Design a protein around this ligand. Structure first.
Ligand SMILES: OC[C@H]1O[C@H](O[C@H]2[C@H](O)[C@@H](O)[C@@H](O)O[C@@H]2CO)[C@H](O)[C@@H](O)[C@@H]1O
Ligand SMILES: C=Cc1ccc(C(=O)O)c(NS(=O)(=O)c2ccccc2)c1
Ligand SMILES: [Mg+2]
Length: 516
């Protein structure tokens, strides 16, 4: 492989305590003579899948648990195997956070939740509601202060307001992944409130992490919204601060997405046993977690013994209070796509580039794109291969899925007829005989669909070849390969054609384009 044997490379995000982590690395090095290198690459959560897909990158990757499902789904992570005794050392619900398709795919480290951080000298009694913040800002502006500044470039920080009055990502009721609440009335109310803060000069659409942090730590703004990792810098600034429950919106609690900081092991690492040793017997201990925490606070750690100490901290009690009012992030593979969609929506709404209504509409479509495409393509491939339709209800957004499939059947019939010779030739050239061969199609399909003008014609041709291949797989008693084929084609489609698909209003555009 490309990853070096007999050493550890560890990537962690730039806002975390990577110097403290490096100290843990140093102790491991001292014991074993094996080098540990910690890096905090820019755009880490995008850089990791890029390099890991080529079999490269770090042995150990740190991020909140939400990204790890996509990584696991892409074959980038080793299954991890803590023995029973080690597992019992961490809270069961943190392990739940790192389970994907019934397998553990990461070590959970700490539970992160946003809180309201406030300056006790400017604001001894922080607002219980978002609604009183405009008036508070007007008072403070008379003194050359502002009420509130927080990062407007990452949706994570605005989500708690979006979800307060009813917005949600993927319906969690004891998951309906088809049920997406990104553009419902509650989500629009929350984002509209944020946009009005900006229009009324109570916030600035350009504000990012660095700018908000600096304004709070310099005592220019009375409040910020941030996580435990930020407390270290505030301590240094000597601002007299407090950490408390987020304001309510429309009488409802703000609901932060709760993240579990987690460490995965690169599927292509030759050092998996070393990584296991490092994570289990050096990092996930009282002294290991302490060393990181003293650099930048981790939040509420997954390790029972050490959390029992940290829980006495009023800042941590506050973190857990907010965490309990929020929801643990899903780790389904399309979480990245969801975050990309909401990110664009908040940025576009805040800048006036789009209205709130249209911005969230696009985020809705972007977030729904994977599951809806998979439903359409899976159903088409399966019915094409068996000759009979699936009579199960389509579920949520059923009209769209049903009409798209009806359109695909009609248009797809002609494409397959006209491409029969081409399809037969390409099938024989590719030699698809089993689930292993199916795995090899992804790189091929990506290369083809990363170039050229996009249109519905070319998309239908791909799905039609999918159906052709599915029929073949059925015929040679490899009917079990059809669903991973459908998943792979869907994955290539929504990845390479994301922006174009959203601009078409997803499959609704497809239906309209081939209307009769
Ligand atoms: O903004 C979208 C972003 O939200 C979360 O990322 C957090 C991360 O969990 C925290 O540890 C901290 O570093 O701030 C990040 C936001 O800037 C999700 O984990 C992430 O996947 C998502 O893109
Ligand atoms: C799924 C594998 C695969 C491989 C190669 C191509 C290609 O166009 O070169 C392709 N694109 S296509 O589906 O539109 C196609 C075009 C002609 C013949 C067969 C498939 C799909
Ligand atoms: Mg639109």
């Amino acid at each position: 492989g490309k990853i070096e044997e007999g050493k550890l490379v560890i990537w962690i995000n730039g806002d975390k305590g990577y110097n403290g982590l490096a100290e843990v690395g140093k102790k491991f090095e001292k014991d074993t003579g094996i080098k540990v290198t910690v890096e905090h690459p820019d755009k880490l959560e995008e850089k990791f899948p890029q390099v890991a897909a080529t079999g490269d990158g770090p042995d150990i990757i740190f991020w909140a648990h939400d990204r790890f499902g996509g990584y696991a789904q892409s074959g980038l992570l080793a299954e991890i195997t803590p023995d029973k005794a080690f597992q019992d050392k961490l809270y069961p619900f943190t392990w739940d956070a790192v389970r994907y398709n019934g397998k553990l795919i990461a070590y959970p480290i700490a539970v992160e939740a946003l809180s309201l951080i406030y300056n006790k000298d400017l604001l001894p009694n922080p607002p219980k509601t978002w609604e009183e913040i405009p008036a508070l800002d007007k008072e403070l502006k008379a003194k050359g202060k502002s009420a509130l500044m927080f990062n407007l470039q990452e949706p994570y920080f605005t989500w708690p307001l979006i979800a307060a009055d009813g917005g949600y990502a993927f319906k969690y009721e004891n998951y309906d992944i088809k049920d997406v609440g990104v553009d419902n009335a509650g989500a629009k109310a929350g984002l509209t409130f944020l946009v009005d803060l900006i229009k009324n000069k109570h916030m600035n659409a350009d504000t990012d992490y660095s700018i908000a942090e600096a304004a709070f730590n310099k005592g220019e703004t009375a409040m910020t919204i941030n996580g435990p990792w930020a407390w270290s810098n505030i301590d240094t600034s000597k601002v007299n601060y407090g950490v408390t429950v987020l304001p309510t919106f429309k009488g409802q609690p703000s609901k932060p997405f709760v993240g579990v900081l987690s460490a995965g092991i690169n599927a292509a690492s030759p050092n998996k046993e070393l990584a296991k040793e490092f994570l289990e017997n050096y990092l996930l201990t009282d002294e290991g977690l302490e060393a990181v925490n003293k650099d930048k606070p981790l939040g509420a750690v997954a390790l029972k013994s050490y959390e029992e100490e940290l829980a006495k901290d009023p800042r941590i009690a506050a973190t857990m209070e907010n965490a309990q009012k929020g929801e643990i992030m899903p780790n389904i593979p399309q979480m990245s796509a969801f975050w990309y969609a909401v990110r664009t929506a908040v940025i576009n709404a805040a800048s006036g580039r789009q209205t709130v209504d249209e911005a969230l509409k696009d985020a809705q479509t972007g977030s729904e794109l994977y599951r809806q495409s998979l439903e359409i393509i899976s159903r088409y491939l399966r019915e094409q291969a068996t000759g009979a339709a699936d009579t199960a209800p389509m579920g949520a957004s059923g009209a769209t899925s049903r009409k798209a499939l009806e359109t695909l059947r009609r248009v797809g019939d002609g494409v397959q007829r006209n491409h029969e010779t081409a399809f037969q030739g390409m099938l024989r050239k590719l030699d698809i005989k089993n689930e292993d061969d199916v795995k090899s199609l992804s790189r091929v399909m990506i290369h083809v669909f990363s170039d050229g003008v996009t249109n519905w014609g070319r998309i239908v041709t791909l799905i039609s070849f999918g159906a052709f291949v599915a029929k073949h797989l059925k015929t040679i008693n490899q009917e079990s390969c059809i669903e991973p084929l459908a998943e792979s084609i869907t994955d290539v489609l929504v990845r390479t054609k994301r922006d174009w698909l959203v601009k078409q209003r997803g499959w609704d555009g497809f239906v309209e384009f081939f209307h009769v």
